[PDB]
Symmetry: D2
Subunit: 500 residues, 4 copies
């Protein structure tokens, strides 16, 4: 069973529209064929995607809502639930549209063209327009000799001058390639004072909150305030169950990492922007340190971006991509992510299968090479003392499965944190807790009836483990619970049981 969780970004790549697969003739012209689209998504779920990411940097509310509805059907086709993660636009910058029939342009090194700060206009081959977050004027934030990078740094522009008359940057193209709509723009070493939380994000979140989501990934978290602002909307709408993963993708994020970890439910290591906003060679340092610190706090860490990039276009990943996924698992990540690979490319299913195969192989080598060390943790509560004793039992003998009966998931989270040498079946009593545990390392969430004071929870643990196919006659399992139901304050009991 795959212990490392997969976040798969959804998009047009899986969506059959009017009988036409993605990238064909008048595709964006046809309307979405829900049942067929849903069968594709079901196939991602069966292949090991544990959560779908809906990126609010691409698509009106209508595209998102319909995609979100397609997954709901997909869960019913697959007969398996997934988490629903919403990724915010956040304080970012993109490339608007081009005048005439143009979608892009060919540029050459030493070529001198223009970038506009004038918000809400159009792009010309000699005048690229910047769509900024909340239409801010960045003209007085950017100095000559700064770099404007387009399509995740795929194309660089050197600010060689500034025209006060038009509020335009004069830029010399540094290398050859593509300029595109809603295509990221980084201007590193730039103190643009974006809001603690833009309105468009406020709006996107409430929309997502009303559709039903489990997780919010908050782009460009700079300070705890950015997390707390989103917490506020979550508690206010009565969605206090929603978990916030701070996306660390700049120096301010890294500088305030400790305070961001405390306010958040987890960290998405957003290496795309991080490797432009900070020295690319420091990203692997920050990755390892962030995984260690988030695991130490009992929270969720997702490693993101370029993990199987090549499988956008090809059926097999490069040796560096297989290495990167493998090493994320060894570093101790709870989850690995696909973006364009699953959302936008020709092999989304294959991307998920491939990531699953790598993650499953790497998990077999965590004993030998794993970087996380649970022996170093302070056990700060009686539930955590029990998670430690569970890890000990799984080290002392061959344990097929750990079962926790968990009201809110707290026990499953502390067991996960300790990385036992076993899968963790988390028996919970509502769908929100079940979906909320789907990014925790090793945790297999399962809905069951809330136990009565006359029920045998150890018999329920065994029978639900047998039903789910996770154990058979003669297997040894560790079950934890709060006994007796409705007298116990917390998980207080551990039972070693041989399956009948």
């Amino acid at each position: 069973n795959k212990r490392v969780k997969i976040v798969a970004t959804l998009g047009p790549a899986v969506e059959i529209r009017g009988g036409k697969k993605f990238g064909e003739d008048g595709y964006w012209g046809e309307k979405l064929d829900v049942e067929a689209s849903a069968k594709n998504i079901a196939k991602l779920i069966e292949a090991g995607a544990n959560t779908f990411r809906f990126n609010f940097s691409h698509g009106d509310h209508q595209e998102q809502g319909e995609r979100m509805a397609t997954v709901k059907l997909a869960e019913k086709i697959a007969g398996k639930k997934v988490g629903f993660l919403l990724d915010t636009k956040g304080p970012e910058i993109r490339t608007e549209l081009f005048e005439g029939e143009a979608k892009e342009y060919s540029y050459k090194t030493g070529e001198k063209i223009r970038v506009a700060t004038k918000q809400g206009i159009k792009s010309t081959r000699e005048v690229i327009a910047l769509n900024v977050a909340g239409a801010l004027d960045i003209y007085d934030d950017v100095e000559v000799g700064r770099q404007v990078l387009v399509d995740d740094g795929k194309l660089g522009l050197r600010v060689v001058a500034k025209d006060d008359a038009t509020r335009e940057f004069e830029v010399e193209v540094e290398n050859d390639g593509i300029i595109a709509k809603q295509k990221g723009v980084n201007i590193p070493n730039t103190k643009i004072p974006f809001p603690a939380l833009a309105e468009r994000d406020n709006d996107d979140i409430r929309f997502g909150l009303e559709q039903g989501i489990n997780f919010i990934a908050i782009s460009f978290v700079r300070t705890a305030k950015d997390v707390n602002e989103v917490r506020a909307i979550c508690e206010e709408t009565g969605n206090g169950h929603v978990q916030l993963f701070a996306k660390i993708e700049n120096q301010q994020g890294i500088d305030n990492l400790d305070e961001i970890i405390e306010a958040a439910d987890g960290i998405m290591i957003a290496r795309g922007d991080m490797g432009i906003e900070v020295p690319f060679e420091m990203v692997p340092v920050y990755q390892k340190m962030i995984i260690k610190k988030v695991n130490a706090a009992g929270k969720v860490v997702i490693t993101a971006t370029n993990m199987l990039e090549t499988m956008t276009e090809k059926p097999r990943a490069t040796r560096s991509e297989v290495s990167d996924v493998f090493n994320a698992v060894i570093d101790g990540t709870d989850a690995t992510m696909l973006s364009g690979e699953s959302a936008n490319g020709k092999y989304p299913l294959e991307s998920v299968t491939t990531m699953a195969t790598i993650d499953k192989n790497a998990q077999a080598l965590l004993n030998e090479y794993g970087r996380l060390d649970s022996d170093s943790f302070e056990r700060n509560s009686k539930t955590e003392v029990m998670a430690s004793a569970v890890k000990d039992a799984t080290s002392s003998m061959d344990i097929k499965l750990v079962v926790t009966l968990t009201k809110t998931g707290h026990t499953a989270r502390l067991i996960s944190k300790y990385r036992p040498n076993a899968d963790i079946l988390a028996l919970t009593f509502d769908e929100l807790t079940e979906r909320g545990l789907m990014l925790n390392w090793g945790v297999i969430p399962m809905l069951t009836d809330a136990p009565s004071s006359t029920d045998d929870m150890f018999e329920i643990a065994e029978r639900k483990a047998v039903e789910a196919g996770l154990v058979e006659s003669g297997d040894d399992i560790v079950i934890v619970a709060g006994v007796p139901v409705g007298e116990a304050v917390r998980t207080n009991t551990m039972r070693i049981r041989t399956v009948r």
Copy 2:
């Protein structure tokens, strides 16, 4: 609470006879005053003696039986039970009696006198007679240039010749001192073929077995056969509950240590004879190795002899004696022993108090200096997996007490083996199991009613812990049990509970 157990050898020193304390006028003339004697022994028990040793090398069956009866009353005065250990005479050699009014003689270096092998005779100042085990003739086992040592090596005799006409050794006294009745005699490097089990021992054991004992310490164990021979008598008389501690006190013992450990319930490190029979400087090597190997086998190790020797005559031990007791605890001994100190000297109570004080102080330093390492053990059974998880819980947080509900003591023994940072209250259901656990490190045995299938054993654990004074409101305890009673095959459950 004292975790290191004390074996106190009983003898005349505590026994008021006819109103006369030990060593006074016509003392051995008066007859034993049981109730007063029993009040003295009760005082040893309250001071921390956990088991009384009855040494069958001194005293007819009548002396032993009456002493054993005095302890039974002592337990009732003290309101605390102790174990009853019988120490066999074994394949040894002693010094008979002297012709005329003599009890001893003064000798000088270079002096040439005689030793007799002729069994069952009398001693003269020029002719010391050897009382041998089962009256064997050792004349053809001992070569010229061998050493005959008397009173635990306190006095040495060099065999300078052999007189065939009388079967006597001609010996030159090596140093000045005491020759005495039933006073040990070692002849190291001597292959005397004593029986696998002498008749006198066979008889002593059956006598002890009929009085009611928990433990047999078998002097001069050479091979597993010596243990198995005693096992046979124990099973045959329906006393299969009795535990056998092999006394390792010669090279053959050390050579077959692994096979002796397997057949035995434990090892008494009998340093008195061991330090004459093997190089004295090797005894501390063998002590540490034997403690490690016996702990690894889940069995009991007692360290014996000269531990507080000086307190035979003085109210305060030497700095080397305090060091020796302290270091036995750090090495990982389950128990420390007094012989002459409690049996024969002027300060038996003070000897017990002193050993208790040292043992209690040393226990506080086992985390820092302790030699035993439970992390290195293979967990070879599900009860042992649980003993490991208990040790983990006691390492992760402050645990006042571990409670085991144990039918035969097996769970208490495996918890003890792991040396948790807590006292171990062992709730058992018969006196034989209760007394049988009294030499296991950290174990506080307590008799209670066998639980019914409708009882709450976690409530019974808490209430018996509160009754015994070991815990109060707010303390955290770890309780293990086989649940449910009469369905569980073994200890299968661990509960962390805060006392009400």
Copy 3:
């Protein structure tokens, strides 16, 4: 900060100026090689931290290889820095043939139906791809219907759907969009092609490279120790016993025989391209970490190769997965990282070396916190190795700027580099072959000096050479090792802790 992790850069047309024309400008191939301008490009890769150039004999002919090696010799004079020369053999491999009309390549679409010829000694057309099989073997009876023929490190899959006995051709379906170029690696998993012990082509390539002057041979598709021994025999026979053999592990037989291969070789190149097609792709990170640990424990060189900065063939910045792979290869314990297409065939060869150098330099500073190699586990099996252990201890006890070894053959420098001290290793040696021969050992800065006389102060020399190299300044503490005295010492026998004046 000196870069301790070594870089192998593959050379090809990408650095080469032809008639004033840069790589992939029109008529480029029309023009003659501008040697001086090409040597000037190559000098920049030496300055950016390429320690050894790779000459892949799977591509081009003797004339192109020989001219390229001569251009590098000029580049060393322009840079004032020497580099190693590494020859990469074809091995028991399959490559695509040249095409008729010297077309370089063709694009194919999923579902396209084409043929693969088995007849040796012919050229490909777009519709009939011909194979150069090592030993000129006929593979027709070795490949069944249903086998996959993969082209260029598995970039393009071809499914065998039928066999024509008349022409001994395979009828194949293109499984994915991509390119068949000339001289591209061809894999056919789960076949047993009886390749010869040593191909005649390999015998000739190695002998031609030995003639030009090389320091290293990377032997492709090492299956057993006999593949290493066959090349060793040629190096010894031609009086090139100083040439080091790196076995390329890139199939299951190589993995199966790793122990005897490491014993017979001077090092291992982890050839991940072929390895990740010949074995399960997800096993390659397991084999990588394990090979680095075993080769370092044997006191030998390990090179991690292929796809390390792949995206930089076309773009000026690498992907996050690529920077991760380079950084993790350093943490794993690699002596060296390698560039293939990035430096041979790409738009950014200089920037590829500069980027790798930057990642390698950053990763070395985290070896204390994260490094996998554990020198405390090693048996010190000789007195030089005991001294290597003591040097490591001295660099752990205090801030040592530099270790200096006066080394005749490089043995002391290899044993110090094995222990991965927390310092640069200045290897003072007395001949250029030993000097170039150390350029892929972790942390080693090889430098030529005069063999010291029995009346020289080797400790004074060590300090002066270090100061002249700009490695140390007054107040720096250095550790120096030497066999003292010269002419009496059997080995490195002396360690001196010295403060620079």
Copy 4:
């Protein structure tokens, strides 16, 4: 097998022949000292492995101490082996006075009622025990009814049951059977007697010992660093700056001030006799293990003292608890073990040294499995210490028979001994004071050689001296350290691994 753990033996009458009479034969005291025959006895204790003799100034007068030191100087010439000379001061202590009629002692029974005088300058009778109080202090107002007066390391307890203001005498009850002898330690726990900073008696004893020629002073009852500094000032003032100070820790103030005492001293003597009465007896093993670890971490000497083989005062074999205590002191990390009554006052002084030597030699072979000291934890705070660490590493990497240090002051030998290498340390030094001054450092075999000239081969000398000492034979590997070259080197800067010819 060389004994690495050092032995201090206290000398007294037990080795001394008087008019052909051995110790405790009649009229023994009647006769004059047979110097040659006494020196011959003492030579046997040197041969059995006593590295330093202790001269306890609490017992006897200057004349007896001076004669005894002269007898030892003769013993060294007879044995052909040098030993250290250690003076033990009285300190701020109480001792029983001499008795009238020069009776040596009296026996008392539990319940016997006697008196203790506070008036200074008088002799004891059996019924009125007089005290020699350091500083000739009047202690009458310092001791309340209910205090315990303990005699001879707590062997005999006296309960104070009343006070007679007329005579300023204590009325006391004997609590247990035993002996009050002349010049015996007296403890009175939970009193605060204002002893002087340095007693005039101590000033005179130290100055008399410095005149005879000593290497070490063990300062009794060190309370603070000022007690060490007061003695240091006298050693420096008299031109005896080479004399080493071992602070005796034997009360709670000493334990409280341990850090500043270790800083000020050259070493610690763990004086367990007084310590185990002035603090809870059951704390002494805790303080012992902790003092050994702190003194070894400071690069200094620790001596474990008192009751180590107590039973061998009267008997030829020690108890099992006594052999355990010696063995465990070695495992704890002690540089040295000590004999008091066993060697000074007993029937078996030679056998006591032989027995300790045997236990010490056996225990050193188990330091690898059980040793408490951990040199991996230490900061290497100087370049000599870095070299000491590297020597240890070399003795862990391979079988080293011997470490040889050419040491002017012994500093390199102390730093090597601190790291407890798995080898004997041959310290080649150029003066007898340095030589005797190293005789209590763990593992150090001090040996006098000629200061080497700037043209000598110090590595050839090291090997020859080692071979002449019979420590090594051809084929043995040795590690040698030196400051090279002589006259230029600021410190030990060179390590050589060398195979004996």
